[model samples]
Every structure is written in structure tokens, then in C-alpha cells.
Target: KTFTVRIVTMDAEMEFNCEMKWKGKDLFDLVCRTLGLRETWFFGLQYTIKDTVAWLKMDKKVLDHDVSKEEPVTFHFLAKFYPENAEEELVQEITQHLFFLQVKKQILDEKIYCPPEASVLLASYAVQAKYGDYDPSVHKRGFLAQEELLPKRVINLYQMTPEMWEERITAWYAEHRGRARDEAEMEYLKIAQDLEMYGVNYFAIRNKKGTELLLGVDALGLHIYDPENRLTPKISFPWNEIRNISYSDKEFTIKPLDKKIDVFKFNSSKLRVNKLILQLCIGNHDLFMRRRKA
Candidate 1:
């Protein structure tokens, strides 16, 4: 029943022996214990399956899911819930670092889109976090050349070379020399949180009218966005206004508190997409209610 399990985090990989009978919560608790993380609600263990990510079921055994065909099972520990205020809500430096890493990954992967100038700004904050103060003599023109700081699309659109972009990023990096690593990461997150796409987990789906759109779930509410223009929401339903969210197969429906308004309905591309959306909806709303009471 014993198997080697690998928990991949932002900075390192932790491997441990676990019985096949172990539940998700047991592994999750062990991960938190290792990290010295107390405020554990903001994170969850996620495993990738069929190219889509799913949260590890806390009540179910890890062996129940078939993620990889390889021997050692691997699960990625990620930030499942985005806090309203990371600086205030995050208690530990390690937690902040994890959030920083995850957010940076999302930004780089284009899951969280960033405008060109804004991307440069965030890259500067990342530079500060990594290398502390920017130095001309030490951190010369090619310093950021090896860094994958900006999103792939943003980096390619400009005619400027990598060094040229480095020059631009360095100017901003110089302005943030005094901030420590934790402070720099917080600054990065503070700017990022205000962005339209920061905390949003987007899924490509279609409306009843056959219009292609994006469904976004975040700390506050549910948002429907025009795929081409993601910055503004076509429709928004705050957690307080959302009475229920349900789905069956590819069809998903959102019931708002106002009976006068019709329920918002959309269709996901795949059957499993609906399940993931509903799970996120439930988890986000649960956190939203908890935050309200406390």
C-alpha cells in the first residue's frame, strides 16, 4: 500500500512515502506542517488530469484518481483561493512567497494577462524580489536576459530586443531598490490584485446565443467576459447576489438572487469543465461567506 508521493511547490519538491489509503486532507495537513503554514484555507493541492487541473479531493484517497502513468505520483500545491488582501491576510513569508510564485507563473503563462507597461512594472518588482537592489556594475544590460519575467505574448509584440526590454525594466527596478524581498513581492501582488485578471480563473465557454465568452471566478464574484476584451465584464454576479450555481454535462446555469432577472446560462466545451466550474464556485463562495462573518 505504500507509494512514493511528490508534492511540488514553488521552490522545491518534497517526496514522501504514503499509504494508498491516505486521504487528501492527510497529505494536505502534512504539506502545511512542513511549510509552517497556519492560514491554510487559501491553498489546496491540485493535480493535473487530461490537461486540466483539478483540486485533490480532501475526503478521497489519492489513489482514486489516475493522474500520471508513471511510478511516483506528483501533485502541485497551489493557491486555490485568492485573498482580498495578501499583505494583511497572509501571515507568513513562505505563504507570500508561494503566492508570489503562483501569481508569477499565472502571469507568465498568460492565464493572468498583463498589459505591456504593466507587465514591465511587475517584472521590475520580481527583479527586486530575486536580486534585491539593482546594480549597474553587477546587474548589467544582460542581467534580465535569462529571466522569464514577462508574459510570452507581451515580450514578443515589441520590436525592442531583450536587452532593450531589460533597459526599460531596469529603470523601474532601480526605483525599488530599498524594498526587501517580502515587501517587493507584496508590492507586486498589490498591483496585481487590482488588475482585472489578477485573481480571475478563466474558462473558455459559450453563451446561449452562441457567442464565445470567458467565465471568470475570483474572490468576489462570477464574471462573464468577451473573449477578445477580457478587461471588462459583460455580466457580473457578486457572491451575495448569486443564489445558486449548477451544471449538468456541458450546460451550466447561474441563478441570481433577483427573481426578476433570468438565470444566466452557458455551455462549457467539455463535460468535466462544468464540474470544475461548480467546484470553484462552491469553494469561492464558501470563502466569501467566511470573510463576511469574520
Candidate 2:
């Protein structure tokens, strides 16, 4: 008796057939070995339950879960979030392709942390994934039409390429991009990680709706992701329309920043969200330091 299972990695999904005797740990191990894994402890096999994904409980069983063995089951080779065994953890590294994506997403989602130049590098991949590959004609036409929405660092590396760089990017497109958000997200992670921003961190702030926006602080003025658009932003400010930022008692206000017919109140109670904005406004990095003495 045997069962078929698909091993989903950050790169692609592979299939494996095992005799019915194999269970969770055993099946994951066989797949790891086949994948030539060294330190195998930081890995686990997970399945989707209900509408959310759940892991194989250390004390759980293989066939005991409500999974269908008659049809090929889907199992993910995920980085272990909780280390049940000290021995199984050493194989994990923030740089490894699979583990990197997990840690990266966690950080972007306020789960963990990454560097400086690396920040620019990672932002490039994100841009590609969100904007869809860059256009050569757009670049050559002289002056990016919406360059304001993108971090200059990201705009510089748009759809560009190099050792680990070539290998990582090439391998991913070969796997094929899918239409789902998760699939789209993985491709974004692949591009970001492989191109090697692979190690930079960003300043993030959470808004009332719980959206975290990546920011840019430079001579071009304080910049942030476009609230209404995806994977984009605009540059400049101190131009009068955008002005002084203030925060207190967990509440922040971004004054002079509303669009037509919208007397919007720009504010946030989220600490990091408030702090990152202040950095650009008063840290001598942006154009409005004089305006934001607070």
C-alpha cells in the first residue's frame, strides 16, 4: 500500500510516492534526503486545514488527519517556526532560499528582521513582482513617468540581473508564475531573495487599517507606498501640500496631506508607523526637517 504526496518547496512542487507505512516526520525526511538536505531539523511538512495552513503536530499522526490519501496530498517543506527539537534547528539559516522567504515575509509583516545596500537590492525584486517586469522602452524614454512612486534604489535595479543572482532568478521563471496571490507572492520573494536584497531591512509603519508601508528617506523628500495603489509611491513634499508630522499618546497626524474634496486627517496611533515618518520629517534626511521641529 502506498500514498502519493506533493512536496512543495519555495521553488516548485515535486511529487513522491511512499509506502503506506510512512508518516509525517518520516515522509518529510525522505523528501529532504532526496533534496540533499544537510541540517534537516529546521524543516517540517505542513498541510492546509480548513481555510488556514497547519503543521503536523509533533504528537500527531499521518493518516489520522482528515487528509485524503486516495488523491495526492499537498505538503509544504516549510521552515520550522517553533523548534521542537534542538537538533533539527541547526540546518536553518536566514540566507537559505526557503528559510529566507519565510523570515523575509515575517519581517515585512512585522514578524522579524535584514541591511542597508541589501535593502535596495531586496526592494528591486519586490518592484518586479508588483509592477511586473520592467520595460526597456520606458527606461530609455528618458525619465520614469511614475518614478516618484518607487524607491530610487528599487527603480535602479528594476528587472536587472548576476552568480547566485543568475541561478536563483533563472530557476524561478523556469518553475512558471501562477495567478494566485500566494503564488504571486512566492515569485516576489524569490526575486527579492535571490537578487540578494537577500539581506536588507526596511523601516515599516502600520496604519489604522493595519497596512504596513515601506518608506524611503532621501534628498527627494519623504516617500511611502501609494495608499491607493499597489507596490508604488510618489516623491517630493515640503511642497506645501504635505507638511509637519506630529505624534503623541500613540496617535500621529500627517497634516497638509489631503487630496481634492478630501479634507483628510493624516494620523496614526501605531508607534513604528509614527516613528518612521518622523525620521524622514525631522531626522535631517528629508525636505521638511525645518517644518517639523516636533
Candidate 3:
């Protein structure tokens, strides 16, 4: 049987026609080819099942994954594995583009919190990437009015007028006049990389005592954050310290290397949450080990 699949990227939506026997890698290959992305390891295709995120298993056949045969299946191309040094590791322009787009989306979606000052600076770099050298003749007053640069939280904290914020952002943008689009994006990522929440995928979960908490997964390891103040983590478990991670239904458990210390156990609201936590932990831990060997 023939099936139609649609892959969504930061820039556009791509449609592909395939038969029932194709593997997930086949569709991913087509996506990378069309997008001009060579460093494919940093990205993955994801789809939501009942509002829960699941990565497409490249090793499995497309039909085996239960992609709805009746409707056109849609997958979101996302940066699954983040490199330690984006400037050096992200060798291709398309790789940078996907990371830039995903990071921008996360910031706007409030998934990753950006400081107000840093927000303005990042916005300037984004402007540089899109409009190039700012020109007084063309980029007149209210030029950035249409731009969605700052997060909603940042805008809400504005005591100064919108015009004042625009002027400050424009000042920074003008300073980047000579930089190329690629350089401008690199600068943006460099600043964002230092953010405490950068690259963290947070999931809402509960502790053994039933306290609601946030479970953060990143390149470093697993972090537990207080829901009220997510700026810093309360507890951190680096990959080296983690002995094993296992889940049953909604209960997720982490075994630490220190035998004296009790195992860390938590519960998610749904089974899907545990599934994603396992996937991200494995992916991040694998990268951590690979980096050591390299």
C-alpha cells in the first residue's frame, strides 16, 4: 500500500510518497537530502501521539510505527542531540539553521527561559541574520514592530515603552552590520548556550512524596527543578553518576552509582512522559560516552 507522509521543518513542510515497506530511515534520508543537511546525527524526526512526543525509530519500518494509514502522517524535524561546542561541532549551515530555529521556538514557547537583557541581544543577532546590515534608509522607525523577537515574559516585564526597547535592540543590531548571517547565528547560539535552561527538555512529574516537580534532561544529565523557581536545579545527576534508568507505567526510577545513596524515584502523570524521559536519557548518555571515547 502507498502512503503519504509530511515532514515539518523550521522553514517549510515537505511531503513524500512511500510504500508500506520503507524503513523510517528512508524518509529521514529524503528529508536531509532536500534540506541540504549533511550532519544528520544532530537531528531526529518526532511525532506526537495523543499530545505526547515520540521520536521516530529509524530502525523500524514506517508501517510498524503505526503511522496512521488513513491520514497523511506528519513528523516534526527537531534537534535531538545537541553538541557541546555548537560553533565547532555544527559544521554545516543547515545544521546551524535547524538549531537556530529550534532554539528560537523554545525561547518563545517559554520552554527555555531567556533573561531580558540577553533577550534583547539575541533579538539583535536574529535581526542581523534576517535583514543583514541594518540601514537607516530602509529599516526605519518601528521596523521591528512586526518581529517576534522577545519572549512574552520579557515583554510583560517592560516598564519602558515598546519604542524604548526597540531602540535598544536596534542599537545592538546596528553594531552587527558587518557580520554575515552565519556569523550572526553563531553569536546568538554562543550567548544562548550559557543560559541555565539552554538545551533542557523539561517534563512535569512528581516526587515519591507526591510533590510536583520539573524533570530536566540535557546533555549534561538529569536535573530536578522546583516549579516555582526553575532558574536553577535543586539536584543534578550527571551521566557518569547514573547507573541505570528504568520505568514502569508512570513510575520512573534512576539508579545512582553510590550504593549508599537511595535510588531516585519519581512518577509522571502519564506513561508517555516516562517513555520520553527514557529516550532522552539514553540519547544524552550515549552522546556523553561517545564524547569521552572521541
Candidate 4:
């Protein structure tokens, strides 16, 4: 007899087909064969009966009787006979299978599993591998610039702490925190798009230039913007507190092009500027375009 098993995830689905000649062959063997497990050590067996009373009757009474009466049982009877110690083995196997299934589902769904800290570490490593030790004098700053003269800014931006990454994402989410679900999703998409444009593979951001100016997320989920440039604006945050801050205060610093030095006092927890609601005091354009030219 042959049986089919189906596995589904957000991104894809897979099916496994199995054939068994004898009922004595354990369910574990079938699963192993379907999954292409060649190693002997990598397999476990389990069985489930559709009817408990019928299974007990067949195993304890029917099978125990004379062979003439038993003859050849139908496929229904054959499928019900579980191996000795089946209960304990089934429990262990099912638990393990469920755990793996959950992990697979998360990956398939593109769900973020690594906390903000770990994500920062990955981004930092990617940046360093691409830009560290490269000369900056050869590159130009603006768009349509030569690729070689691009300053390797992409690489330097990779080094981030966990709190920094969480801060950036949290700040972004704060913008649409109270908005409708679809609107919030759109905001997140926009942030993701901007981050990608800035070569921010492991993190999200609202502006490409800002991402280039900021370090990627770190093992601690912190990000340090403008780490190499002291004159550039800086922003940092812990992951847990990001969602609570107001949108206006989410990313508090913007270095103006005209100002030689912009010394702003930012109180993150208070969400106020000099005891006033911060967002109302600043022009929307000024807040969004706040930048320190490199």
C-alpha cells in the first residue's frame, strides 16, 4: 500500500509519497524513505491507530488465537498493529517532528527569528567584508558617481549594536504605530525599500542616505549611526522600548547642511523637547531631510 504526506509553508509546499509491502514495516521507516534519509542512525518510528478498541482486539485477542482463524487479515487490520513500545516512541517522534515543523514554517514565512542584536551582527559582517581597509579618497559622494569612488560607505555601515538596529526599526514602526493595519504595512514596506536602496540587507530604514550613515544592527540589537564621522548625527535604542516612543521623537537628530554644529538635547524616554510635543515644533520637511553631509 502507498501513502502520501503533505507539508506546507508560507512560501512553498512539498509532498512525500511512500510505499510499503508489509504492515510490519514501521511508520518511521516510511517517513525516512520519503525524506531520503540514507543514514541508519537518522530515523525513528511511530504508529497511530484509527480505533483503539479495534487495535487492542486484533493485537491481544485475534492475533493471539489460532493461525487457521487469523488467515490473512485485511489492510485495515494490518495498519492497526503497532510495534512493541510504540507509545513512548510515538510521543518522542511526534514532539521532535512538531518542533522542526515550527522552525520550517517560520523560515518559509520570512519571519524574523534572530533578534535585532543578531541581525546587526550579520549586517556588520557583510559591510566589513565589502568595505573594510578600502581607501575613501578615491570616491565621490553624490549620485551618478564612479563606482570605485563610492567611498565604500556600504561596508562601513555594517557594524552595528543590537540596540541600534532595534532603535531604527522601532523608530520606523512608530511612524505608523496608530495607523490602520494596511497603512502600517505600507509604511513598513516603504522602510524596507529604503533600506534595500541603501544596501541595508539585514535591517530596515526610512532613508537610503541615513542607512549609509548608520551602522548595521549588532549582536546586542544596537545600531550606531555615523560611527566614523563624529560630525554626523547619531541615534541609538534598545529593542524593547522602540515601539513605545512617539513617531516625532523616534529618530531625534537631523544635522542641517547650513549649521556648522547642531547640538540637540534628546530625551528619548520623555518624548518631549523642552517640555513641548516634539513633532509639532518641527516642520515635516525639516525633520525628514535632516542630514549631515559627509
Candidate 5:
């Protein structure tokens, strides 16, 4: 019997007709080969079977789970269900693809919530990994025709272009590209950590004096780090210590029960503060820090 197999990726799905009565695994491999997919050392095909999700039995037949002649079944292209800590060793292209998929999956599943800055940064990387490069004309916000250029659960910052973001990331990479051989070899991540709140977050702000004060918040607390100024003081408040936080105009004041005392307030710039600062500050406090608790 023949059935249509809907091949699904994170952004969209494609349909192909197949004669599954003969060899199921062959068709799957054929699909991969046609797509020019590599061996994909750490990935698999999964589909829903009745109520529970199941993996493809690429080697043998499963009479109990054969599809009917009518409806199409969906098989999602994905990384291994749970591969741990092995990605740093993968090749750049494959690793980037895996990161894109897992990152999107994590966001859709509501597992990791990053703010507009992190969200925008992650989006450029995600699209670049899958689509090869960014087309500013197509990928910019409000263009629904490209689909994935629009993402869910994150505020889309159209002004942040992949080209612009890539420059800073690549510039950061230049400083440490020729480091020890034991570290990650792929260039993108090297640049990512340079971003103040790297792991995952809404973000930090300010270019003050000689230091770039990056502020961000996650589940545990407020993250403020000065990339250039180690001699000057920096704000690093854990969630428990911050009694509360307030933002107005270009200033954010924190009521903390810590080293700085009753209340500490600061503005990002002596001249002009970008609108993004307040957004990053509030986005971290309310969207990320609060949702993390629930």
C-alpha cells in the first residue's frame, strides 16, 4: 500500500508519496539523500502512533503500526530525542543545524524564554543555519510570506539585521579565535559568550565610560557585568536579594538588601539612552524572571 509521508521541519513541511508496503527504511533514507542531508550522526525520525509518539523502525516492519491508505502521516526531522553534551564536537554546519532545531524546539515547548535582544540574536542565527543566509528584504519583521522569519513567543525586533549582528559577533570571535585547541572550534559560539548575558535571557544595556555595562535577568537573579571596567563596581544581584526593581524614563533603581544598601539607582548614559535599555531591563524583570517562577 502507498501513503503520503509529510516531511516536517520546524518552519514548514513537505509532502511525498511513498510505497511503504515494500521498504519503509529505504524511503526514509532516500528522502534524506535527496535532501542532501549528511549522515546526521545524532538525529532520528519520529512520528505519532495513535496516542504515543514513536520512532521509525528503519530496519524492520511493524505490522501493528502500518499506516492506512487514506490520511498522511507526519514525520518530524529532529535531533536525537536527548543527546547530551556531545554537540561541541560536531562539524559547524551540522552543529548549527542542530542548534537551530533544538533552539526552536525549546522555545516552542516553552522550556527556554529569551528576551527580544537574545530572541532577535537567536533568530538570525536560526534562520542563517537553515536558510544559508539572511535576506533583509524577506526576513524583516511584518513579512509573513517567508513564514519562519516570523517567530512565536518572542518580540520581533526588525531593526536588528543579521548582517549587523553578525559583525559584532564575528568581531568578538576575532579576539579569541586562536585560543587553545581544546575549546569549541565552531566560530559562532565563541562570539555568543561575548554577549553579556550569553546562556539565555532578555539582556543588559549601556555603554558607559570605558565599560559596556550589560544587564540581564533569568530565573535566579539580575545579571549586570561590565565587559571593560573591572576596577569599577558592577551590579550583580541574585533574585533573593532584590527586594524589587523599578524603571522610568532612562533610569532603573533597584531596592536591594545587599552590599549597595537601601536603594541604588542609575542611568545608562550621560547624554542619550537608547529605548532598548528600558525594554531590556523590564523585559528581563517581568517576562523572564517572573515566568521562570511559574
Candidate 6:
């Protein structure tokens, strides 16, 4: 007996037939065996067939029947395949099936590793990076100012709630013209909002010795503060967003100076400090420091 199989896709269709002489084999099993393929190879194909059958089974779209004992038998099948060409039809079908399966797997993987808040924050950063200016100082000033500020307080207040952090920081920006201010404040607000949306808080503290600490929150729920700013104090996040600085229990010690020269030396570091701030908040340090060969 002969059986015919037909397959079709959006772009192509094919037909083939095979004959079997078994007397006791089931039609489905015979068809499966005649394909000369393992059950695993047909697992996905079976599901596709099952789905097509659910909708077309009653409409007589599939053919599976026995022929008379002495006559040759033929079965016809039809399916919509992809990619059009006879040589590429099966390849296209299997590729599409695997593509969708990978899509499902990717969705499951995201659910496992990507938190909703983290996704939002990463997306916002990407948007801002393309459409917005890059400034570490603004992030520093808004969240790491020398003096206590409303923005810093807000970060402290909403440290635990991702949603509230976004809300309150947004509200603060709206009420304060946060981004419209000088470059420092604008940069600060943008990065701060990005951090808040991701459920991270910023902390700033100025020690008695005049050292400043700027802490950034990471996805792992760990606190990282930059302390080298005491000397080079440049914003490092632009170069490395995951930068960390060590903190210690030691207190800063300072002595009051009386002489003009002594006071001048004390304040000389201010230029480096301001440069560091600018480096964090504005121009690329190497470019800014570059000089033409002379």
C-alpha cells in the first residue's frame, strides 16, 4: 500500500508518498516509522500536527486510512511551511519552531535574572545616555553635595522602595527645576533618578577632616562609596559604572591654620577638587588635559 504526505508553508509546499505492507501496524505508527526518523525528531512536528489537526481534523484535511488487501493505498497530507523553496522548506519550518522555543526560553531566563525594577533602570539609563548629557558631578552634587540637600534626603527616605524612589525623585526634579539648573545639578538629578528607579540609594558624608564619601547602590543590594575623591576625587563612574571605594572607621583630623601661606596651601587643593568635580560631572579628563606637541 502507498501513502502520500504533503507539507506546505507560507512560502512553499511539498508532496511525497511511501508504501507499506504491514497488516497490523497502526496508521499513525506506520506514518511515523516510514519517515525513517526517531520519535524525538517528530516530537515538535507532532505538536505542530496536533495543533493543525485540532483546527482541521474534522474538516478532512488529514488522510490516514487502509487500502484493500490487494490494492495500493495512498494518503495525502498538506501543511503550510516557510521559506518557499523545496530544498529549504523543512529547514525553514524547523528554524521557526526552534526560534519560538528560544524566545520562550529567553523569557523564562529573564524572569529568573532580571527584576522589573532593574530592567526599568537599565532602560532609562540607556535612554538618558543617548538623549542626555553625561555628568558625574551632577549626580554627585544632587546626591553627594558637601551640605545636606533635599535630594539627598529624598534618596535616604526612599532607599527601600523602588517605586517610591522613582516617584519622589521625579517629584523633586519637577518641583526644583532639577535638570534646568547648572550642569552639576542637572547631571546629578539624571543619574540619581536612574539609581532610584533601580532601587538604589545614594549616600554622602563629609568627615571632620574634610574628606567626602559618595556611595552608589548596586543591583546586588550592596553599598559602594568612592573615597579616593579625597585626593583625585574624580567621578569614576563614567569610565566604570561599577566603581567602588573603601571606607574605614577612622575619623578625619584637621588643625586650624593661622598664617596666610598656610591657609593658601590648605586651599590649593581646591583647584584639584574642582577639577575632579568637573571630571566627574563634565568633560573627559584626558581630552581636557591634552596638549598639542610643542
lDDT of 2 at 288: 32
- For residues 131-201, write the lDDT of model 1, one tens digit per residue: 99988889877987888988889978978888888888999999997899999998998888878788888
lDDT of 3 at 126: 92
Q: Candidate 5, residues 1-294: lDDT per residue as tens digits?
A: 666777776546787776656354766676667556664544456665454445556665422344433466667766442222234334445445444555555644444544555544444444344444334455453332333432354423446554554553333333443343223223334433333333333333553343446554443456665645322226667655777776676667778867567565655542123343333344445533443573
TM-score of each: 0.93, 0.37, 0.93, 0.19, 0.41, 0.16
Query: Judged by lDDT relative to the true structure, which candidate is superior, 1 or 5?
Result: 1
Of the candidates shown, which would achieve the greatest lDDT relative to the real structure?
1
Give model 1's TM-score versus the native structure. 0.93
Number of backbone collisions per candidate: 0, 9, 0, 16, 2, 15
The TM-score, computed over Cα atoms with residue i paired to residue i, of candidate 5 is 0.41
Deviation in Å, model 3, residue 94 alpha carbon = 0.6
- Writing each residue's lDDT as its tens digit, candidate 2 over 1-294 gives 877878788767898886665667777768777777765644567776554445654444577765656568777777543222222333433325465456455535432223324443443454444445444454233222333222334334556432234333323333443433334444445544333122222344555676666543332344555544323354334424655656776655555565552322334555544544464345332323333452
Error of 4 at 160 (Å): 14
Against the reference, the lDDT scores of all candidates come to: 0.88, 0.48, 0.87, 0.30, 0.49, 0.30
The 10-residue segment of model 4 with minimum total lDDT is 75-84
Deviation of model 6 at 135, angstroms? 34
Clashing pairs in 2: 41-88, 115-200, 115-201, 122-197, 148-234, 149-233, 250-269, 252-268, 254-266
RMSD to the native, candidate 4? 26.2
lDDT of 1: 0.88
Q: What 10-residue stretch in candidate 1 is worst by lDDT?
A: 63-72
| Cα distance off (Å), candidate 3, residue 5 | 1.4
In model 3, which regions exceed 4 Å deviation? none
